[PDB]
Amino acid sequence: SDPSSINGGIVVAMTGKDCVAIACDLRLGSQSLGVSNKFEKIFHYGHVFLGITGLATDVTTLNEMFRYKTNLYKLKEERAIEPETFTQLVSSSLYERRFGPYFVGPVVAGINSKSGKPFIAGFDLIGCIDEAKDFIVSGTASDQLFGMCESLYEPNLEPEDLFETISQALLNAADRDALSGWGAVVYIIKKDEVVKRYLKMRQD
Amino acid sequence: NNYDGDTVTFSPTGRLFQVEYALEAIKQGSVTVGLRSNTHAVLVALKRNADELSSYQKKIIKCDEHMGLSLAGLAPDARVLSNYLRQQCNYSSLVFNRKLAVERAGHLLCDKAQKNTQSYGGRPYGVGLLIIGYDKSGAHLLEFQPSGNVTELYGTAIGARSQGAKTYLERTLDTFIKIDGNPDELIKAGVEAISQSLRDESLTVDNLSIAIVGKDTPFTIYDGEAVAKYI
Amino acid sequence: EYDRGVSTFSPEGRLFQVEYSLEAIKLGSTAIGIATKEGVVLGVEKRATSPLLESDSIEKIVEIDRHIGCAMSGLTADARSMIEHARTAAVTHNLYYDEDINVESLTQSVCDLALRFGEGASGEERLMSRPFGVALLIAGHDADDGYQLFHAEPSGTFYRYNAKAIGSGSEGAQAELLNEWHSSLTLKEAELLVLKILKQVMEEKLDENNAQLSCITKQDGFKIYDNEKTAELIKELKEKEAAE
Amino acid sequence: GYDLSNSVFSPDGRNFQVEYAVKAVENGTTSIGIKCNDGVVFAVEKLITSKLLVPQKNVKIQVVDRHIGCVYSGLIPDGRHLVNRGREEAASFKKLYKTPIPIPAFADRLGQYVQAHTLYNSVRPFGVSTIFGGVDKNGAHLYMLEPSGSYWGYKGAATGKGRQSAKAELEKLVDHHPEGLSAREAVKQAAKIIYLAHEDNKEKDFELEISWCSLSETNGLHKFVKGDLLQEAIDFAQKEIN
Amino acid sequence: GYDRHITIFSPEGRLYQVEYAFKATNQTNINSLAVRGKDCTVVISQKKVPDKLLDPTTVSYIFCISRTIGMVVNGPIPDARNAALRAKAEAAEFRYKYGYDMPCDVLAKRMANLSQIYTQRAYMRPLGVILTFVSVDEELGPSIYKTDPAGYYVGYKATATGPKQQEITTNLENHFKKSKIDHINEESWEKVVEFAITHMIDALGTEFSKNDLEVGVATKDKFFTLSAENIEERLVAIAEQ
Amino acid sequence: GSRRYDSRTTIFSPEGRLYQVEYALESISHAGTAIGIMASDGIVLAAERKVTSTLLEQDTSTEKLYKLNDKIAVAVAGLTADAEILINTARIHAQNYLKTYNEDIPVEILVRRLSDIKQGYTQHGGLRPFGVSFIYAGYDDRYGYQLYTSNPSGNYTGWKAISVGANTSAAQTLLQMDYKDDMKVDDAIELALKTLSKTTDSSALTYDRLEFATIRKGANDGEVYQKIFKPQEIKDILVKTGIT
Amino acid sequence: YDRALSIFSPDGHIFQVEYALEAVKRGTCAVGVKGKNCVVLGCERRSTLKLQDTRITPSKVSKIDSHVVLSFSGLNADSRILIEKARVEAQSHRLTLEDPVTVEYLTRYVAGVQQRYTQSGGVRPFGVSTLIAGFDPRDDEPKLYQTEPSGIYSSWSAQTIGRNSKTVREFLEKNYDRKEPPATVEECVKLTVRSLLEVVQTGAKNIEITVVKPDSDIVALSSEEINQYVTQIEQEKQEQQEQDKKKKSNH
Amino acid sequence: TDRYSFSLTTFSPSGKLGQIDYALTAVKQGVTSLGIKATNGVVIATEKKSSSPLAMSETLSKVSLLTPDIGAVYSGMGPDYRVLVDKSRKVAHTSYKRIYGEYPPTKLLVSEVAKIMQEATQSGGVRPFGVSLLIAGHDEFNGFSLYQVDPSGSYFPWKATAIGKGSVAAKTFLEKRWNDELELEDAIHIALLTLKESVEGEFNGDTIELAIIGDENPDLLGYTGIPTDKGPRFRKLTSQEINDRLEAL
Q1: Would residue C10 be called left, alpha or beta, if left means φ above 0 and alpha means ψ between -120 and 50 degrees?
Q2: What is the DSSP string of F26-61?
Q3: Which of E6, E92, F171, F204 is most solvent-facing, going by the fewest CB within 10 Å?
Q4: What is the Cβ-side half-sphere exposure of residue H203, based on CA atoms within 13 angstroms?
């Protein structure tokens, strides 16, 4: 097998006009067997959103790894962590197991609370910052996703126009992908309000 | 106890009082007298019982087949040196297909004691050994003090009433050195020497212990019916 | 003090720490041991200090192995450490050689353990800053010397004994040992002789709730005599003082 | 008092524990060192305590490297351990650089070791002065090493009881030869000042030992003086002091 | 009583133990005078040779660290050898990991840090020596930085150390009042040596022989000691002045 | 030597009790008042700062209230400096549990772990302890609201109301005579304040020397909300209760 | 650190051991009495202090195994360490050997913790004496052992440790006979209540009772339950004093 | 062996800990330093005094840079400051420059060094540092802040404070002179006017070390065209700059 082709996973993320959106699929497989049509690969500490792709075990392993580190920051300094400061954190953390690594692709998405700007960032297994203000896509249909998201994308999107471009891009890659699909959930992340809305799609 | 319970300080007279104090441990022990000619070395130890139903304590330890050490101080302190001398003697056989010599072994042991007396929580050891053996260079008889001082002689003694033994040996000096190749006489001359280390306690077969090694003789420990010969 | 060291001297030429240990065998309960060539008998004062104490599951007899017995006297917190090490030594010897360990060799191992005070002498690991405070009566039967009985001090020195008594009543007990012991004694005349010497230095009355016998024999191993037999022997001794 | 350890210090610039340790060397045996053009000539008085003793069978001169004789006075077991320590450092230099160790270099290494015991509370310093020298590619040298881990160059040294007597005679000998003398000739002068310095030990009797490292005779390696050559030295000293 | 016996603060906020080190350099009778030139740093120091039976050319108080920075040691010589070994190693280490030789300033800070840990450790005695590092770098120019056993350092235009260093301090102070600068001006390095010797003969009132001085001169990109042969040219040349 | 200079302060006195445990209680009385009272809707922790000064900023200060984890925060009485080492052990510890069992730490484990750490420091090494006493406001789902005081040698004991710090005896008595088991957070706020007011070490009770924190179950979704009040919200309630 | 904190004393003593026995006199009192069908350990609970929520107060009797109970006297700070260590031991024996612990197995372990720091340098031993009681598995023999700060252990049929232990022991001589223990659970329970109401006092609040029975059954009997038993004890005591007054009048 | 693993800091019988009081004695016999917090910067300021007349003082930095935006200054002992300034710089790099690759909050940093102080009153071979520090700083997440570290290894936030042997005079001086808002210009004129009565001699710019953690300086940034990275908020004031402010009194 590959540690990175064993349960699929894709996370998409896009920017808009005064808002961000992140979204994932719900398909958690162990190889070719589908186990569940339910599993979030998206998590949140305060106003920063972590989608973690790859390896089954490493979704959980890195998630409580950042659970510990997020705590320390909030209890000491009495504030919730910023998107940019989180991205740096993740960069350094991935790099700690250089050899035999963390088997994941995290994707960092938020909207700052100190200036109110969208921020997105990407990572490999070893991890390197992949800055954009476009879109950050990661996973196994990350290739598929890169073409499809471009075709759609327009710099600056109204929060429910934004919702039309990401829903469509994610569903279409994900219903040509073997290890991913089975439902999808899109978050539209506004400065002070998130809606979590599921998408009806092919469950096949 | 400004320097008297302290194994790390000097000691206004260039001493350490603890080395002088470890030498009283030899006084409280028994006596052993060694003599060599050139073709044999001899240890004759006086063993000591703890009462008449108690056995006697062996005061000659065999280290090798060409080496033995005898104690006249504390027994648990004699157990350290014995282990160590035996390790280095077997090493010599295994690695260089060589035999170990007393002279060289006196220096390995010198340095071992020194570096424990340097340390705090250490001690200068409560024993003195005479180490005999017959090696590649002939007989050697070395006297090991709690200080670690090695000197090579034709006759020496350690323990109580040792001064009287050394009187014996200063007389018989040229007698015993010129008996060569007749092991009997040397051994009988160490019995009488140690008869001048007595208080008229006499010598029985279970107080008298001889061990010898020659050129042509193994290291062998004599006791019982094999010490009644030499009286 | 010259015990505030770990191996210090002490103008006398001997430790302080060792001397105190020997006066804490006077915190013991008398353990007497008569060695003969038909076995070795160990008798011990169990000591019963309350009628609310369960005293028949209290013995100062301890099994090293089947062919080696030990009886301890003194401070018994120190003794748990010494008897555990001996049980392993015996078992190690049967591992490496499939053989019965010398009583002499076993006694010697437990002396090697006894020297561990220091923190800068020698060339081994130090897990004590003080010596032991307990003495052993190691009996056993080996096929090279026959039956043997050894007395080990917490100094790290040991003697083979025909008969020894250590404990609180050690001075008066050994005084009788010198006069009454002979080599014409056997397993059973030795056995009633123990109970006679123990009887003087007994502080309650000689009874089967303060006294325990055990032998070590070749043909049966280590057998700790049941209370019915221990009680019998106590009565047939008294009948030979009724015969005076 | 300031002798409780050695991380105590007095305002005096002195430390008391270290001062006491030189007092052990001051009852030691006479040991001298004569610096010569070709080499060095060491000689040491070996006290004959008894007639049981074997003369010239125990040496206080133990060789270090192949060309540095080291000879010590003070506490004999202690000095034998310090000399043992500098043989491990000499073998490390020969393994590592494929050349014998320089005398100034070997002198430096010893100083460090003895320096160290006067810093840490938990070790007992050295109580010996060592007299050492040899011939290398930096030339012939002579060095004396204090219990305090100090050395300097020397053209005459002494240590022991008779350290006063020896020094006084070595000064008249550098005024005799202010352009220096042979190592072969210094055999005869080594004995002489031992005879003169055995008038501080004229309660006792002595055995004469001499050792040399000379470029002129033994091809720059440290060897012993013994046999008829030693006895010329015995005879030289004998006829002058009588 | 333990604040004069190991290193804990007295009720006065001090460490006498630290103090006792500074009083030890003054029993060895060595004085030094160190001046910055214009193309050099000069350091001149006492040597004592009291016996015929001491060798003069072996005995030294100027110990060569770097090939730019010399080190002049005032006070007890066991502690000197330990510090020279440690100071050379550290300069070599810097050459090895940074690809240029340690600046003077920074060599002074590394030994200063080390001196402060030995006075923090109570089972460890500090250095009793006062170390002056002298150099000519081309990062800084002529330099003097003097570290002490306390762990304190500062740069200097000039300095003296020893029991009698208050007399040398007066002569040197007057010399920078008159010149109106913080370093000596001269375009020969030889002459900067000679002014330094003049001011020492004046301060202590004693004239020097060639075997009671040991002179170190750092010129541009080398440090060297003058041999007793070269010191004698300088001491004749002070009369010519 | 090295033994010369030894503290020997981690041993017992003939009282069977350490020199260092006793010393620590004196200094916890030097330190400013911290009190816990347990309401049936929460736990009030109320701490008076040890210092107050003219130019001192007490308005970015939270020098007595610390979050160990989200549902467990503490009040501190003792040395401030000392308390901070134990604070970051407790943070690690809490997260480690959350890390491995995916569940918030019970209060019971959390108090005990800190008790052990203080206990090691008194046991061996010649080490000093951290002479701090914590008053733990904690919630767990297996016993509701739980309240605890801890002592310098690390021991925990349950309470319904307790005071440690300055004028402890006087304070603790006002708390016992008023206490009802039916008290709510509003009452508990006023009682705590009045008790602090009668034992103040200045001449009044003011927002700038007060820290106030509560844990409320009256908060959204019936959950426990830790709220550490701003000095202006401390000012607000002070004016309602009429001290200022 | 290897500097001794336990040394041989000049009395043939250890310093630390005299001190440790004194820390156990100043602490809490646990009385141990064994039945013919149970063991019962009642211990004094501190709840003299006013205003204490007792649900959260750590009990002074802690189960180590499903059928082995542990009680203690002395420093309470020091005691948690023995209880914490014992739990790990119980489960370690199931892990590697099969079976729960025996009482004998824990009796030697706890004695070895106290012993080790006595003999060792750079360590003092705890001020803690413990009662290990319970049953062995696939047995129904009541086991009552006592371990002490020296590293010594002994068996008992009834025992008591802690404060005014002398007073308790003297009562128990005439009321606990080695031959016939109490044959019922209630009378065994009730003997421990009678000792406790001497020293502890103050209702059933400060009194605790733990019963352990054969085949893994530990039940904790609450204060409330204990009150029932007091009232019977008070009528039994009062009535027995009355019939002594009437015989004494006549005689 | 080692046996120096017992504490050199221990409790006194009638409370407190005696060893950290002795260390602070070195601060009130030390050199004097002060800090006024403005609403637009902090000034921190100190006195230099020579060991010899032939010594320099521009070879000594009594105010040192920990990171571009957070500076530190001491009262107490010199030696103790030399070593501790390096440990602070080193911990500011291991723990926010390998982990977040930015400069740490000022509240956090003060905490971390107080840990070093706290674990230097623990175990043998270490007795505390003879300084109290001011760690003046700016972060962007808590604004301007001022702290005083004690040898306790405790910290306190301040609105304006002083430490050294004129501490007692100085905080009383600042009581009239400080106000809720202050301009930075005027904060400099207050800080010198305070340090004027606390020096016994020279008061030039070559004797007074002045540094501001005022506002960002795009000329000490050493790169341009990145407008997300602000210039160093610290700026040490050279002698000529200080001399001007002398004339403004």
Answers
A1: left
A2: HHHTTSPPEEEEE-SSEEEEEEE-S---SSB--SS-
A3: F204
A4: 16
Q: How far apart are CA B126 and CA B109, in angstroms?
A: 14
Of D7, D118, D171, the CB nearest to E52: D171
Q: With beta carbons less than 8 A apart as the criterion, state whether F209 and F202 touch.
A: yes
What resolution in angstroms does the PDB record give? 5.4
DSSP B151: E
Continuous segment of H or E residues that includes residue A53 = strand A48-54
What is the token pair recorded at H2?
Answer: 């080692």
Domain, as residue range, for F167: 1-244
CB E188 within 8 A of CB E11: no
Residue H221's Cβ-count burial label (10 Å; 0-12, 13-18, 19+) is middle
Active-site hit among D29, D30, D159, D218 = D29
- Does the distance separating the beta carbons of H171 and F127 come in below 8 Å? no
Scanning B47-86 for CB atoms below 8 A from D yields none
Residue H111's closest chain A neighbor by CA? A76
Segment 161-190 of chain H within 8 Å of chain F by CB: 161, 171, 174-175, 178
* Residue A2 and residue A15 in contact, taking contact as beta carbons nearer than 8 Å: no
Residues G165, G167, G172, G173, CA torsion sign: positive
Taking alpha carbons only, the member of H98, H111, H99, H68 closest to residue H236 is: H68
For residue E96, the one-letter residue type is: Y
Give the CA radius of gyration of chain E. Answer: 18
The CA-based dihedral angle spanning residues G175, G176, G181, G186, taken in that order and rounded to the nearest 10 degrees: 50
Strand bridging mode F161-164 / B150-152: unpaired
C-alpha span between B153 and C78 (Å, rounded): 46
Distances (CA, A) of H5 to F131, G2, H9: 19, 9, 12
Smallest CA–CA separation between D109 and chain E, in Å?
10
Strand partners, G212: G39, G218
D11: its two tokens: 């305002």
Chain F residue with minimal CA distance to B10? F1
Q: How many domains does chain F have?
A: 1
Pairing of strands E62-64, E69-74: antiparallel
Q: What CATH number should be reported for the domain holding residue F156?
A: 3.60.20.10
Inter-chain contacts counted by CB atoms under 8 A, chains C and G: 102
Instruction: List gaps in chain G by the residue before each (C–N > 2.5 Å).
Output: none
Distances, alpha carbon B22 to alpha carbons A7, A155, B26, B125, H42, in Å: 77, 92, 8, 6, 70
- CB neighbourhood size of H123 (10 A): 18
G122: nearest CA in chain H? H3
The structural domains of chain D, ordered by start, are: 6-242 (3.60.20.10)
Q: Scanning the structure block, which residue is given the tokens 């400096």?
A: F81
- Coil, strand or helix: which one is B173? helix
- Which residue is listed with tokens 């103090």? E19
Helical H runs in chain B?
17-22, 24-28, 75-95, 102-117, 163-171, 173-177, 183-193
CATH number of H1-249: 3.60.20.10
Angstrom distance (rounded) from CA H62 to CA H48:
8
D118 is catalytic: no
Closest to C149 measured CA to CA, from C157, C137, C165, C158: C137
Helices (H) and strands (E) in chain H, counts: 6, 10
| Residue whose entry in the numeric block shows the structure tokens 């260092």 | F20
Interface contact flag, E12 H25, Cβ < 8 Å: yes
End-to-end CA distance of chain E: 57
The chains in contact with chain C, meaning 3 or more Cβ pairs closer than 8 Å, are B, G
Which amino acid, residue A169?
A: A
DSSP secondary structure string, A78-102?
-SPPPHHHHHHHHHHHHHHSTTTT-
Domain annotation for chain A: domains and CATH numbers: 1-204 (3.60.20.10)
